Design a protein around this ligand. Structure first.
Ligand SMILES: [Cl-]
Ligand SMILES: [Mg+2]
Ligand code: NA
Ligand code: NA
Ligand code: NA
Ligand code: NA
Length: 293
């Protein structure tokens, strides 16, 4: 799969008390109970969901992911069962309605199973409805295993994966042009200009694969503020700090903070020739885009 990657991740699920009615009378009662299966406040145009909280080690808050297939293992009355919910089921929100006649001196209980895929509250994954006499005992349904397959951006291998660095606000790729007398970063529409990321003891590095002057390839911050590409050195001016934890992924919105100039970070600022600068108290958003075209 070139582009994105599927990962099975452990999700939290729960058996709620979906509806309760207690018929303390001597006559039977009719009740029109209505439920809504599927993901709550689901977006009609896109299937991509942004996380409101983490999903173990793979997902963290803000990460954009896609479902998938939620699978829950549970038990009710000493019998273990497995309920699955396919892609079209989790996104299409169905409304189910049926009458239920509660007998006299009894209680109707509708157990509702819900899953929480990193904020995505999937309502009524399954249903168990039991009638018990007053004052009888119930069988509380217990969840055993809750997992879900999710599709996320493919993993960026440091040193191998060729990428493009696009600005989040302006929506333009980082290109390399000659400023003064060495290669300097600017912003344009060219897709031919790629990069490759590395990580060492000093930090992250932005190597360009389209250098004008051979050897001068690692992105660094000059004293004047501008961005230039220089030869491989331990100099912290050419190392960087990425806000997102490893492993990095395709389509990740990241920010590059210089290791030498701690407060200063990679951003856009229309200068004399170039427009990609590293300025104090500024940290513009950049999207990592993996190449397969
Ligand atoms: Cl030079
Ligand atoms: Mg619980
Ligand atoms: Na798993
Ligand atoms: Na659970
Ligand atoms: Na109870
Ligand atoms: Na920004």
């Amino acid at each position: 799969a070139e582009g994105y990657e599927q990962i099975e991740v452990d999700v939290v699920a729960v058996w709620k008390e979906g509806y309760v009615y207690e018929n303390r009378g001597s006559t039977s009662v009719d009740q029109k109970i209505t439920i809504t299966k599927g993901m709550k406040n689901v977006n009609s145009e896109t299937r991509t969901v942004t996380a409101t909280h983490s999903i173990g080690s793979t997902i963290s808050t803000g990460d954009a992911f896609e479902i998938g297939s939620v699978e829950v293992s549970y038990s009710h009355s000493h019998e273990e069962s497995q309920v699955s919910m396919t892609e079209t089921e989790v996104y299409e929100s169905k409304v189910i309605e049926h009458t239920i006649t509660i007998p006299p001196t009894s209680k109707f209980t509708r157990w509702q199973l819900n899953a929480d895929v990193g904020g995505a509250d999937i309502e009524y994954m399954y249903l168990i409805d039991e009638v018990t006499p007053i004052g009888g005992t119930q069988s509380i349904p217990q969840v055993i295993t809750s997992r879900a397959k999710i599709i996320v951006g493919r993993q960026i291998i440091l040193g191998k994966t060729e990428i493009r660095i696009k600005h989040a606000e302006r929506k333009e790729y980082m290109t390399v042009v000659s400023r003064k007398s060495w290669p300097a970063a600017t912003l344009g529409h060219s897709k031919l200009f790629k990069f490759v990321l590395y990580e060492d003891w000093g930090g992250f590095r932005i190597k360009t694969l389209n250098t004008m002057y051979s050897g001068y390839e690692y992105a660094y911050s000059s004293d004047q503020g501008g961005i230039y590409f220089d030869q491989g050195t331990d100099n912290p001016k050419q190392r960087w700090a990425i806000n997102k934890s490893l492993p990095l992924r395709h389509g990740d919105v990241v920010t590059f903070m210089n290791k030498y100039f701690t407060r200063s970070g990679l951003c856009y600022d229309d200068g004399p020739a170039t427009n990609v600068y590293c300025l104090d108290k500024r940290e513009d958003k950049w999207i990592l885009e993996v190449v397969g075209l």
